[PDB]
């Protein structure tokens, strides 16, 4: 009996974001090439949809502007890294800063 829904606790309990203190993070302080590439791609798409920038040197493509923002440490994004899914509905992340963190080769 029952249509697989009435007893179905399908709605997962909402999670609370716990941010690990800045002195407790144990992940690399250097952007992995995946993370740097994702940051550049997100920033460049957002410049395509919006167009605003903090650069002084004006470029003719959002890719170049986002790449320089990552290189010149003005990209307005925060890489958050998540390490847990606790049964207590408590997602454990540590929010890193791409401006403070090192930058891989990418070239």
């Amino acid at each position: 009996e029952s249509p697989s829904i009435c007893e179905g606790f399908v709605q997962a309990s909402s999670q609370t974001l716990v941010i690990i203190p800045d002195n407790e993070r144990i992940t690399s302080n250097v952007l992995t090439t995946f993370e740097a590439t994702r940051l550049v791609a997100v920033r460049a798409q957002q410049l395509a949809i919006n167009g605003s920038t903090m650069l002084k040197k004006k470029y003719s493509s959002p890719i170049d502007i986002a790449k320089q923002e990552l290189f010149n440490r003005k990209i307005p994004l925060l890489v958050m890294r998540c390490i847990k899914v606790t049964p207590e509905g408590q997602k454990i992340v540590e929010i890193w800063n791409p401006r403070e963190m090192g930058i891989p080769l990418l070239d």
Partner: protein, 205 residues
């Protein structure tokens, strides 16, 4: 010639487990004839926990490895002895492990006696100094507190770690109960030896 090798390496295993003997050591001849006639050689060991561990070296084709009534009688009467009896160990021939009725009596007495742990091992576990084998890296049991510290630093529940059966020869020689952690120093062609921590699960039947 598994009898002589088993006879020397069981005592080496008792020494490896950091246990003391409650009796005097008979020689090879008395051991083998008593095994052949009685059907088992019983060895008592005392641990630092002041618990008692008994080992039963069953015969290859004796009276005790074929019929469940006698095996049941042995377990019932030996487990009511007033020793602390931390762990009981049965060392039997390899083909005996497939024989069902012995496994049934083993599990029945395990369920009947909760606090006592019973394990039945084949001969090949105690026919060689297992920790001294070249191919076997160095296993060591980390305490619960340091394992918990390692897990909490790693944000890992114990079930996340790689599993190792409690019947693994190095773990058996170490004396690893299920639910405990074993740290391993495995040689590596890449990093020149590396350390892993494995979770001990329930043994084989």
């Amino acid at each position: 010639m598994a009898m002589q090798k088993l006879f020397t390496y069981i005592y080496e295993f008792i020494e490896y487990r950091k246990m003391v003997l409650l009796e005097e050591k008979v020689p090879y001849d008395k051991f083998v004839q008593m095994v052949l006639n009685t059907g088992f050689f019983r060895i008592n060991a005392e641990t630092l926990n002041h618990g008692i561990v008994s080992v039963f070296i069953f015969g290859a084709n004796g009276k005790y490895v074929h019929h469940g009534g006698d095996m049941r009688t042995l377990l019932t009467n030996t487990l009511n002895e007033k020793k602390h009896y931390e762990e009981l160990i049965l060392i039997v021939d390899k083909p005996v492990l497939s024989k069902k009725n012995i496994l049934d009596i083993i599990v029945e007495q395990r369920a009947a006696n909760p606090t006592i742990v019973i394990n039945i091992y084949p001969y090949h576990l105690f026919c060689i100094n297992i920790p001294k084998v070249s191919a076997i890296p160095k296993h060591k049991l980390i305490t619960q507190e340091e394992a918990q510290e390692f897990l909490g630093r790693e944000y890992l529940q114990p079930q996340d770690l790689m599993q190792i059966s409690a019947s693994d020869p190095p773990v058996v020689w170490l004396g690893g109960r299920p639910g405990d952690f074993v740290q391993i120093e495995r040689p590596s062609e890449t990093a020149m030896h590396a350390v892993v921590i494995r979770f001990i699960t329930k043994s084989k039947i």
